[PDB]
Amino acid sequence: GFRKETVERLLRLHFRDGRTRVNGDALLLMAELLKVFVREAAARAARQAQAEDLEKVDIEHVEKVLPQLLLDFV
Amino acid sequence: GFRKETVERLLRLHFRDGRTRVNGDALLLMAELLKVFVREAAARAARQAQAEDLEKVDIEHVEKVLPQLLLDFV
Amino acid sequence: EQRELLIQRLRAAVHYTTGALAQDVAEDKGVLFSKQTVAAISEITFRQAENFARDLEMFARHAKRSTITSEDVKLLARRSNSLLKYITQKSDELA
Amino acid sequence: EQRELLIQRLRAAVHYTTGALAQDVAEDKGVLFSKQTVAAISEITFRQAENFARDLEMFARHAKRSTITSEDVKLLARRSNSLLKYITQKSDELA
16 A cells, blocks of 8 residues: 555654664565554444444544554554 | 562563563562553543542543553553 | 655655555445545554654664664564564565 | 462452552542442553563563563653653662
8 A cells, every 4th residue: 555665754754863764674564554554444434434324434433443543553 | 559579470470481570670660650550540530520520430430531541651 | 844845745645545545445345435534544644653653763772773674563563463463474475 | 270369469469559549649639439440440550561561571572681671661651751751760760
């Protein structure tokens, strides 16, 4: 889902040390981790909307699933 | 709040490696961290009960504050 | 300035990818994600990438390294057996 | 058996400390914590100690160490500037 070059730029936005770099393996794995995170957010919010008998997923559904999502990803 | 010997026994209950030990500094700091965690849980649940006009703090108040508490402690 | 525009471009890239990934979930589950919902998931993901980035930097430094490796990424997934297994699968696939 | 009784004794010790700490918060805020609430906070704390213990073990190992030190505890607090400052204060106090 995510390109390695995008992941590198995203991570470099937040590093506090100028020495910090990220190798290619780690960029690929981070792209995979971010993809799983997005897919989980979407799938969980969709299941919450379905449980509330709605076909359209709203911000309220994301908000309901967000705390456990963040807890599951540390 | 917590004794170092109790903290050591608590942590040793969960270590998956038989080599794992914990030095005295770390036991003291973990006792302090656990004390902060309990105090935060109690204070947050108390403030939630107060916001709901109750003087007695109930499990529902703990449950309401629990997700952000766990997120704040990683 | 340049950093503000960079942040905008990176938020836009995350948003594009988020919409693509959400569309796949939508077709599988028979839901639709509104534009507001896609934007919310994208912003949550952009913010979560900051937590990941800061952790990776500190994890590598904890091991006396300035370069983040697969070992640091695996440590991000340590609390979920299934996530660690998935990341480890993807790592083991690499040449 | 022995491990089950150990777990009971450790849960009891955490519960005793939790009640003492809750009583202090109660007197300050003018609330009371029911027995059920104290037991719930204690069980949450017992479970959170497992997450801390498993993280500390992995953090020390990430640095090639079998002994957990203050550096590993500081890494637990890394995401909260205020918690890290507090833990660092307590660490700096030690002889």
